[PDB]
């Protein structure tokens, strides 16, 4: 028992192996999972004190999300004496200047931040690959496709291989998607994308030593009946919503930008109409899924959502449309509650009324869910219980949270044992039901759960991975698990022993779900046995396979200055450039992408374009470019679009729009370039 955490024998063995050869670290959940990474970082801390120009290396800790990046940053600050910096996009990193960017690199010996920020940082030559010592990739499973991890590690092919730092593939799970079929080739691709093989536990006492931190919670299946009959009011609200949908498609708000599919093949409704359609469709989903009382809570949430959208709307047509949506939301609520209350005359005790409607205005799913609550936490210690509720959609979080609050106040036994809480990821929703325009409870939901303030955490796949949480006592998987890694991390959330991990499934759908469960268990066993028996002392990929894993995509363009224009970031760079062009709030407009018809494609590019797609881009009128760049013919729409963006960015760089670091030139850069031509005479007075 020491304030300084002691490196373990297996941890030191793994650190020594990673020092000898880079690779992927596959470990179960625990504080040691990050402790091994901290030890590896401390191992290569020799050159931190030396300046960057003298070859003084630095440490880079690249992360998937901002929250877990913050957790790792504070962990490495608390466990090490080295200077560590935190860098996320929301901090205003980009407006920084080369000088103070370099001197903060000097100041902070370790850098922690999200993947995109560091990708932009390395592409802009703020740090060289030789300037880094270790590059840690936690949540190694996120190396799928064009994720920033994969493109970042593709970027290693440019610099000399001798200068490349040590990569660390920290992960708690290896399979990312439903790629159970031939796990071996998927992990081979993963360990070619990464420049080292996977290392994990193989010996029995090694597994026990890992169990000194990790655990092996059990899982229990809870099943409920289902029936297809629905109430008359369900159909009444359905018909009213459909009539409102018709009146909204015929609303004819002002002119809006054209929205098209991801492949630009078909049109879409304007974002203003699509938003409200999404709201009402999700409300109908919640209604049919979790009961009519849950529908009342969801409609209450829709009240505040429409209230805030109406308050912040500006166009009179949009104002009126929001007002109509809110009015119909009130009418729907009124029909629902009037149906509830006419039946709510058999008994008048509001506790008994609330319990009765929760028992009988709700689907069997919610009934069995709350029955599991009451039989699990009837009169137990509120400190003892600490459970997570995992749901599909964001609004399901609020619906369940409100329903559980009203049931806690509707249960004298559970009255003081359970403290529910919800939070959802991006596209965040006003966390209230009362339009409370000001609140002072500045403590976030995650902090409340961490400190034990909330003993229940309801979330939609936001607490499942990356976030730092205690060993949860129980986990409720309300909706069926879609993906292998989702199941693995969800079962890992119940990190305490003898935990309760519940799979809520329909009685009529037992077979498919249980076969999925055996499929996931088989995948896990295959991963384990593959990591046991399949091993080679090479431990690192060869040059030919390294280039083969990345030769497929379009070659990036690199300048003699050292910057690299990543083809997958061409669209982001171009759209950033188009953001900065307008000097008026009403003047902003995105580029007009276009797909050439087959006759047009042929008459433009000969017969050589047959069987391949072409995407044209027309720059906004205010921009200097007006040449209608044509993409190279490629196999698919996405490749052609990426090629068009890459070519347009190259042209913009050639015509001086980009500062050779591939960012759009600021006003300061232009005036500095003109200073010598027009303001040179200021020099004699010691000014510029």
């Amino acid at each position: 028992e020491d304030v300084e955490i002691k490196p373990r024998g297996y941890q030191l063995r793994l650190v020594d192996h990673l020092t000898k050869s880079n690779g992927i670290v596959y470990l179960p959940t625990g504080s040691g999972k990050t402790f091994v990474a901290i030890l590896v970082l401390k191992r290569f801390s020799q050159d931190f004190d030396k300046p960057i120009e003298s070859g003084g290396k630095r440490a880079l800790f690249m992360c998937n999300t901002v929250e877990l990046a913050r957790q790792q940053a504070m962990a490495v600050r608390r466990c090490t004496n080295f200077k560590v910096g935190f860098y996320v996009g929301e901090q205003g990193v980009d407006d920084w200047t080369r000088g103070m960017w370099s001197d903060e690199i000097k100041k902070n010996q370790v850098l922690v931040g999200t993947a995109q920020v560091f990708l932009d940082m390395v592409t802009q030559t703020y740090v060289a690959l030789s300037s880094l010592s270790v590059v840690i990739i936690d949540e190694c499973h996120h190396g799928t496709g064009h994720h920033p991890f994969r493109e970042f590690m593709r970027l290693f092919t440019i610099a000399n291989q001798t200068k490349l730092p040590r990569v660390v593939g920290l992960t708690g799970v290896l399979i990312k998607g439903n790629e159970i079929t031939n796990v071996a080739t998927k992990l081979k691709e993963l360990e070619i994308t990464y420049r080292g093989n996977i290392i994990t536990v193989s010996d029995t006492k090694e597994m026990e030593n890992v169990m000194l931190y990790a655990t092996k919670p059990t899982e229990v299946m809870v099943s409920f009946p289902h029936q297809e009959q629905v109430l008359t009011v369900t159909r009444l609200i359905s018909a009213e919503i459909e009539k409102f949908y018709v009146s909204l498609d015929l609303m004819n708000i002002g002119v809006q930008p054209i929205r098209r599919s991801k492949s630009l093949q078909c049109l879409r409704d304007p974002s203003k109409k699509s938003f409200v359609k999404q709201l009402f469709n999700d409300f109908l989903y919640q209604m049919k899924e979790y009961g009519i009382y849950a529908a009342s809570i969801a409609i209450i949430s829709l009240i505040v959502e429409f209230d805030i959208k109406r308050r912040q709307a500006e166009t009179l047509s949009v104002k009126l449309m929001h007002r109509t949506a809110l009015t119909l939301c009130e009418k729907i609520r009124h029909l629902l509650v009037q149906k509830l209350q006419d039946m709510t005359y058999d008994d008048d005790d509001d506790n008994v009324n609330t319990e009765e409607v929760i028992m009988n205005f709700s689907t069997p799913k919610v009934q069995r869910f709350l029955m599991s609550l009451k039989v699990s936490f009837a009169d137990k210690d509120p400190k003892d219980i600490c459970c997570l509720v995992f749901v599909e959609r964001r609004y399901t979080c609020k619906c369940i949270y409100g329903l559980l609050l009203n049931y806690i106040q509707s249960t004298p036994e559970l009255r003081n044992v359970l403290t529910p809480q919800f939070m959802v990821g991006r596209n965040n929703i006003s966390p209230d039901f009362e339009s409370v325009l000001e609140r002072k409870w500045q403590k976030s939901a995650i902090q409340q759960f961490r400190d034990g303030n909330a003993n229940l955490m309801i979330c939609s796949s936001v607490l499942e991975e990356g976030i730092d949480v205690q060993a949860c006592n129980h986990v409720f998987i309300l909706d069926p698990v879609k993906t292998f890694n989702m199941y693995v991390q969800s079962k890992g959330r119940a990190r305490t022993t003898e935990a309760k991990f519940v799979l809520f499934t329909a009685d009529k759908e037992r077979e498919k779900t249980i076969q999925q469960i055996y499929q996931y268990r088989k995948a896990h066993n295959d991963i384990a046995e593959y990591l046991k028996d399949r091993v080679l002392e090479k431990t690192e990929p060869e040059l030919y396979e390294i280039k083969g894993h990345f030769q497929d995509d379009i070659d990036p363009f690199t300048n003699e200055n050292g910057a690299v224009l990543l083809p997958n970031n061409a669209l982001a760079i171009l759209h950033r450039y188009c953001q900065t062009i307008p000097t008026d709030a009403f003047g902003f407009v995105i580029p007009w992408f276009h797909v050439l018809q087959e006759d047009e494609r042929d008459r433009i590019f000969g017969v050589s374009a047959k069987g391949k797609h072409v995407i044209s881009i027309n720059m906004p009128v205010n921009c200097m470019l007006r040449d209608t760049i044509y993409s190279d013919p490629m196999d698919n729409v996405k490749t052609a679009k990426i090629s068009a963006a890459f070519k347009a960015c190259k042209v913009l760089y050639s015509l001086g729009e980009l500062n050779e670091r591939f960012v759009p030139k600021t006003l300061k850069e232009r005036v500095a370039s003109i200073a010598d031509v027009h303001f040179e005479h200021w020099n004699k007075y010691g000014d510029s």
Partner: peptide, 16 residues
């Protein structure tokens, strides 16, 4: 119909 059909009061947690 007019009501949600009730369920048993004594379901169990099944090892799976």
């Amino acid at each position: 119909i007019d009501r949600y059909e009730q369920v048993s009061k004594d379901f169990e947690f099944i090892k799976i």
